[PDB]
RNA sequence: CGCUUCUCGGCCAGUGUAGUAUCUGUUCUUAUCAGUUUAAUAUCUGAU
């Protein structure tokens, strides 16, 4: 369980849980080709610049911890 | 109980019982010293006494 | 689609010997290939590159003709980025290029 | 004392003895064999060539997984070659 | 509780036996079988006057002239 | 204290130097060594006075020796005289005290309270309830100590065990148990054990180096549990000084320790230490050890050594050249073991090793020599048969010249080598045929060898591989003539060898004349069997099934013996010949020798009145295999005769019977099953029913499957009605097998029939049969799968009742039903109900009762796949952060189990979450609208 | 010709709590010179004693004849004392002086 | 072994490893504050 990421425990902080689901949101968005294309259409960029941006936002999302 | 003991990370505090120490570890102030020290909470650090060793342990964590 | 399970990025050698496969994060495995007795393609057993808390931007087969093969894992660690209450490690981390190196004879894979 | 090795899942077919022979390994059960067992030659090697994935005797057959463990997708975790408390080998 | 003699012959089947005629002759070989009249099948039997012959195979010994049977 | 400790070592050997030198100049001129009052205050525990009676008293004592000879020779003799007692001495215990043990448990010769530590020691004699007494005492006492782990602390414990795990007279059972206590408390104490660690190994390490197989494996288990349990630097800082300890024993073992601690904490942790050791320049004894360590690492970690291979070797090379011998010796030996875990890998890592090795090979005399072989031999498989080609061609010489030694260490070695050298693809056939064989069969095949164990095996192997190359008839030809050599173990050997060979190579090569010599042989052996052993028997079977219809001229001689033996010779040998038929059935068939099938059928049929179990068993076995060749309707004891003839046997109590019988009955009631009028069957039913008292699994196994077969023959209602009555008194899950009948039955005609009977039968007030019916549903759905899409409704309300309490067990088992249902239905659209049930499940979440919980985990996991997450997750939100610990413990454990599977799905189902000051928890993406 | 376990020590029990070193020294005195004795003077060990001789075979003759021997109205449990165990209350230190001494006088 | 008589019948206290549940008996609802502890209690730890 532990070496399988996204594992929680009862000490789980708010922040960590949410950052988790962010990241996983992302590897989905890189995953599901369409969903990606959806984003691309909406906010006009490349597919690439999308994926790139995302892979920037990976570690950050929500901003610094507490 | 009523046996001399000391926790180093907490104010070099004194504890009179060994059962008391586990309770101190699952504690508000003990976790405040850890987390505010930069050593994050819960169950990996339980056996801590001195401030120094758990710093390299936390470097092993991250 | 996982965060940790391969199939996302995929790379493979010029000489076809071995092929590396990877998720986005944490897992990079490698399957070696050699044609059978009759030269029909037999698949090796896997291997593992595991490295904790490491983002793989992109992977590419490498060229070394008839060597121990190489791969390029573009990486970044976020582990600095978590344990920085400030938000400095947010900046001032640079993505780490590493070449992994298959090694047949020893048959593991070494950073 | 008795728990999995869960080292990585190779191509090596599993091997079971007389005793263990029917059992879908994790669901303990005879029901509905469908799909097939893989373990690491690390787990499975040498004296372990055709060794029981449980008891340490010679394998006379090949464990099939249940369907139950199938849809719960467990068969794909680390290689179920049980290590006892003592050194496996 | 009584021990029947035919039961004693039965258990010495496949063993070595000495068969003692009412005359001065004796045969030792493996007891293969017997009937109710105590005719007897011996295997590879030594024939003695108290060594005449080494028999090879199977001998039917006529129960008629048999006096004593000895297991061993 | 550590520095202190080693100080004490250099002490010890400085002393042995003083004494040994004192008899070195004294020889130029032990336990009995006299003692000092500090030394005398060193042994006895606390709490004793020394005395004086008097300086006149202690003067006579001083006079004692001088007056022990003096008054040894003087006058005395002793005289009894012919002529309200008290004082009953208090001895023994509930588990009782052996006489010797008084010394330990003496303080249970006092009877008091009010002494505090001493109340903890005096309470820790709970041991004795471990060491001796009744099994239940052992159990309960054992836990009582486990939960008292933290409390008394190690110190008192090990203070009070290690005497016993040291007991000069300690029992083996007592040993193993007291180990159990050491493990079990070592699941708990972690930081605690530190000061005790060495003070543990000292007992244990002997156990690790253990003749008994199960002994060792325990030992290793706990030395890990300790080493991992304690800290690495603990283990090290502990265990240096045993390296240079004078006794080779303690080194030896000390290694195997380090082997284990290394399996625990990984090599690379530990390397720089080792690598330090092998460069220790003080003395060799270390290096002898450190190298050994490399080895036992090799052996243990085995196939996994692979990655640091190169480093390890990079240690060990600097040995081979050493001035001291052993260090050479052991060293190389390690290289061997390495490669043997290396298999065909890492060749060039060994690389820089060779060129000494080859040279070393030349110049040697002795154990070391053959050792270097042990290596090279294990190398060759790792080379390139061009390079390997050359180097091979050099060795096979020295190998030749060396067959002949008297050394057995040798013959093992050179043997295993040949396996490899001439065990090669890149080696040429004839060459072996000429140079090697004639020696080989000469010096090796001898009666020295086979009496020993290993050599037996290793031999067989080797010869086999020489077959796999030079062919079959070559070998077998030369060893046939020895089936008729007298002594058994030898014969046994040739026999198994052949068996394999015609295993691998195939019979097809063998000529004719030789073959006559086979079968004549394989009888001649088979006719004389000290014990009944699988060897000759199997070895035969394979012989025949290989020869196929080449065999045919030989039957009459076989079956002739088969019968002759079969009879007499008194019964012990009978079962053997029986089996012999068992295996050769197939051959008696396809060749179409039917008169044979008349013979066997009927004459076996007679023995089924044989009273010895161990015959009748093998008898039936023969019958079974006889059935699998000749079909039913051609059976010469046509079934009508037979099957009843079996029927009464089922009482037989004894094992092998019940096995082969129920097996047989099964085959026949499956296949023919018409031959026998129904009435007979229903007798069979009411006889089966108590076969479910079987201690054994397999009996019940096939038992059930039969129960089904007949249930097909007749039709269901009765047979479940009949099963409904059965298994009333089965103990703790023994009856369940009956339930398994209800299941399999319920398939083998449309279950769609049977339920109403079943369901209704949950009405009955008798509790345990209620839960029985629940499991019935359990296995039931597990066995039906898709079909559940119907009767689901039927059960659902019932699951509601049972699932609502009477007691746990209701909730446990029922919940299991939910599981197997929930998988089976999958995605046909019946969720709605399953949602409904989810409710009455849900509250069960909380309990400590292990079976109830791992049951529930079962439930919610399956239910996940049926309902889907999103619904689940909608039960698991609120739980995560709930203030309490208890709830968070669990709702997390659930949410994990949801989480690992279907992580990919979730994304949708995390709800919106409002972003705070330092952070943004709203994922803005999804709201981009075109 | 001896079992290895037995040692110059014997555990000795079934004693009265009045009983005399005079009695003791005398009786045990038969087999050989006493290295020395201890008597449990303590709440628990009142009733038992240890005995140690200048030789084992001394003690062997002892456990031989004194086996179950009588004193007063009691039969003394007579046992070869175990060893190792709890002693390490002391430490091995105090070589240095002595082994320098043999180092010195004899020069060896 | 055969015949006769009588009776009855058949056919047209095992064991082993792990673990939970449930009764009864015994002790406490009892002075303040300081720490550990708990969802909150409780419980545990000191002195008047």
Numbering used by the authors:
A (entry chain 2M): 15 to 80
B (entry chain 2F): 402 to 463
C (entry chain 2I): 112 to 222
D (entry chain 2L): 7 to 95
E (entry chain 6d): 10 to 59, 64 to 85
F (entry chain 2G): 300 to 328, 394 to 447, 454 to 485, 490 to 1304
G (entry chain 2K): 12 to 119
Paper text:
During spliceosome assembly, the pre-catalytic state (B complex) is converted from its precursor (pre-B complex). The RNA helicase PRP28 unwinds the U1/5′SS duplex, releasing U1 snRNP and allowing formation of the U6/5′SS duplex in the B complex. In this study, we fill an important gap by reporting high-resolution cryo-electron microscopy (cryo-EM) structures of the human ED spliceosome in four consecutive states: two pre-B complexes (mature and late) and two B complexes (early and mature).
These two spliceosomes are designated mature ED pre-B (3.3 Å) and mature ED B (2.7 Å). In the mature ED pre-B state, the disordered ACAGA box is positioned in the vicinity of four proteins 27K/RBM42/SNU66/DIM1. During the first step from mature ED pre-B to late ED pre-B, 5′SS is released by PRP28 from the U1/5′SS duplex and captured by U6 ACAGA box, and U5 loop I recognizes the exon 3′-region. SF3a120 enters the tri-snRNP and interacts with the U6/5′SS duplex. Notably, the location of the finger loop in the early and mature ED B complexes is occupied by the β-finger of the RH domain in the ED pre-B state.
